[PDB]
Design a binder for these strands. Structure first.
Ligand SMILES: [Cl-]
Lengths: 295, 293
RNA sequence: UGUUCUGUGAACAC
RNA sequence: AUGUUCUGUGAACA
RNA sequence: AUGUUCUGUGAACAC
RNA sequence: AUGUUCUGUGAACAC
């Protein structure tokens, strides 16, 4: 009858089908499934929540798919290879700390030095505590900060450019954060997904910087991250061959990535609700099919 | 330093409440205290002000716990009536106050009886319930608010002029609104700007106006007055949990200088303040869990 | 469940 | 600028 | 991997 | 609750 809405029924059935996975999947997937299942599709507010819950479920699916294709043994080596490919370097937790402190010693006050003068400033003062220090190794550290936009660079006609630390990076805490963020950026760009615990170990040699690294990771997320993660997965699958044809999920993940995650977003049409619930249904089914058959 | 260690431990003990219950303002003020670096003199100064701030809010939270939200309106109007005052509704009060201005705008001096009749006569057509009694209660509200310059006469009715500063509607209504807020405060009632807008105007379009009034009544004396106000609430309720035990702690916290250019604390003063605020916030949590209402 | 990170606008006071 | 109140989301790890 | 040059969101060399 | 008296930062009465 005309009192029955066909879009509503497909949406409802998709959610019911997904709810069967609760009674396996990861804890984050379970939590996000529960959130979707609790959305009341008879209300406009619950329909808005269902759209965001579907997006959230989908973004988590892509993350888990990428992690399944990622070699944990080779993770550190790939990071440092990616860092070196940009002319950058990490000299170890102790030596990097000291190096960045020596950069602050030079530029805290707003002085403008040349790259050559800045490198030597650091190498000289660093050599006693760390004899391996060199113009090359310290040049790579300065390049890391350059790539991070830490410097205001002033060109001079037919001469070496002068470099000042920007006002916002003239403390150790601010400078080290941006430095850490830049290494995270390089990892992201190379399609590496590294946990806060792993990052703390890599950059500080302890597990006492999880929260600091977690803060940096979360500040680099945007609403474009879901769409970029799908493109990333495509690159991973092209590299691996794609036995399970996870490429079939592409237009579903794209649709989910195009959902507005803001809470003050325009509420969905009935067609949009059905399409989102079918998309997320297919995507979560694809993940479970992969775990069981193509592990 | 034994004083430093007690202070540090008190703050650590309080930091446990950030994990699970307390209100968002209590959480914000706990965070501020926890972030104070007690190894520095500047952080020790901040810790004293944060402890005071956290204590003043605890008194607010204690008062709110003795507050049934369903009975909040009835308790307000009961408190208003207890002072011989009255609120006749948003429409009728507006009209009444405008009629008071019609009489006294120019600086005329009328007797209370003449002023009441002036209003009742002109108000009766639009509002038939108007009376000498009901309008007398409104005039009393303005009297209690110090809106009138009163001139005594030997063996005769006193004359009353509106003070210069209240000879416009906006100024007179503000002071009128402030006086009802005052009465609520004195009866140990804590009402939000949104609730006040609804009570006094019948809409939510006067939040800011009421918020302005509330914030202007906020001074460094407020903390000490709020403690006396809680005492009145507890005397009315009987005080099963013996929240009166917190009185000298709240008094100590109320006596802290809230100015940023205040003399920095001694180690003894730091310990005492951290122990006082610890006991006070613990008293709030003990009350919520064991003596809920 | 625990341990963390992260996120919006609107008013008012000086 | 600084403060106060109200209001607003998701995410990571075991 | 390491080093050297250079005004580099990075280039070019050496071993 | 409401009303009446009154020079009330509020008193005293009635019902
Ligand atoms: Cl239907």
């Amino acid at each position: 009858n005309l009192g029955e809405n066909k879009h509503y029924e497909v949406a409802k059935k998709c959610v019911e089908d997904l709810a069967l996975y609760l009674k396996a999947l990861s804890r984050p997937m379970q939590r996000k499934l529960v959130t979707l299942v609790n959305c009341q599709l008879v209300e406009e507010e619950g329909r808005v929540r269902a759209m965001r819950a579907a997006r959230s479920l989908g973004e988590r699916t892509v993350t888990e798919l990428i992690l399944q294709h990622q070699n944990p043994q080779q993770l550190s080596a790939n990071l440092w290879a990616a860092v070196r490919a940009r002319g950058c370097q990490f000299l170890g937790p102790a030596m990097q700390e000291e190096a960045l402190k020596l950069v602050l010693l030079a530029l805290e006050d707003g002085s403008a030095l040349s790259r050559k003068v800045l490198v030597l400033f650091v190498v000289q003062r660093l050599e006693p505590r760390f004899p391996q220090a060199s113009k090359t190794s310290i040049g790579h550290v300065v390049q890391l900060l350059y790539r991070a936009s830490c410097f205001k660079v002033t060109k001079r006609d037919e001469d070496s450019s002068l470099m000042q630390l920007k006002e916002e990076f003239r403390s150790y805490e601010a400078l080290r954060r941006e430095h850490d963020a830049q290494i995270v950026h390089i990892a992201m760009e190379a399609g590496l997904r590294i946990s806060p615990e792993q990052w703390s170990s890599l950059l500080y040699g302890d597990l006492a910087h999880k929260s600091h690294m977690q803060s940096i990771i979360d500040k680099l997320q945007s609403p474009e991250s879901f769409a970029k993660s799908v493109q990333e997965l495509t690159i991973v699958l092209q590299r691996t061959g794609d036995p399970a044809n996870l490429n079939r999920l592409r237009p579903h993940l794209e649709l989910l990535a195009n959902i507005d995650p803001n809470p003050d977003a325009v509420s969905p049409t009935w067609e949009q609700l059905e399409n989102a619930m079918v998309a997320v249904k297919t995507v979560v089914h694809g993940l479970v099919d992969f775990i069981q058959n193509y592990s």
